[PDB]
């Protein structure tokens, strides 16, 4: 019944080489969030890093100016039936 996927993923601030993103926590115990990013043109490596479960913002650095990026966030979360598992991702596109 309860979704484990974050909502309202968006870019709240941007420079040509960086993005500050944020999201609303899902109503579950999130142990950590995993942020992924890569160039939308599907010819570049996707990178990932984690943020603690208490944080609902993240900075993405070292980007190229004028380039479309696909950014996703999913959770590693605790629930009763599944103990620790990974949620589906929420995904946005953003052009530096």
């Amino acid at each position: 019944s309860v979704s484990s996927v974050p909502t309202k993923l968006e870019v709240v601030a941007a420079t040509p080489t960086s993005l500050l993103i944020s999201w609303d926590a899902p109503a579950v115990t999130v142990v950590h969030y995993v942020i992924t990013y890569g160039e939308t043109g599907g010819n570049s490596p996707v990178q990932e890093f984690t943020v603690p479960g208490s944080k609902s913002t993240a900075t993405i650095s070292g980007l190229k100016p004028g380039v479309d990026y696909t950014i996703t966030v999913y959770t590693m979360y605790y629930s009763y039936s599944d103990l620790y598992s990974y949620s589906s991702p929420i995904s946005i596109n953003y052009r530096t």
Partner: protein, 124 residues
């Protein structure tokens, strides 16, 4: 073998009740899952009432006592689910609710055992 059936019947009912209450209600308040809490508090309450009640009639059938305590209360309560809940909160950086969960489960369940015992003892 008769004792084994008491454990299995009581245990299966307790385990089933815990499964139903936990799956139905735990997700309502994830910082202190209420299904896991209620079954620990309830098991504490039942063992307390059993403690007082069985003292008064010591030669009653060992079958009923075994079904209720080792079986029902034992199947109903859980330290394992309680532990992962707390462990997950600790890994999530949620120290206030990890501490709160430990205090409410442990102090709460001991209080319920006392209440069960003293309610029956007061009821004469």
């Amino acid at each position: 073998i008769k004792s084994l059936f008491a454990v299995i019947i009581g245990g299966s009912v307790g385990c089933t009740l815990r499964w139903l209450l936990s799956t139905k209600f735990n997700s309502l308040f994830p910082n202190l899952p209420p299904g896991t809490l209620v079954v620990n508090l309830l098991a504490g309450l039942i063992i307390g009432t059993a403690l007082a009640y069985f003292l008064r009639q010591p030669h009653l059938d060992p079958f009923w006592k075994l079904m209720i305590t080792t079986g029902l209360c034992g199947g109903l309560s859980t330290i394992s689910t309680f532990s992962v809940e707390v462990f997950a909160l600790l890994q999530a950086g949620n120290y206030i609710w990890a501490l709160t969960s430990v205090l409410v489960h442990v102090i709460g369940s001991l209080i319920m055992t006392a209440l069960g015992f003293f309610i029956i003892t007061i009821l004469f």
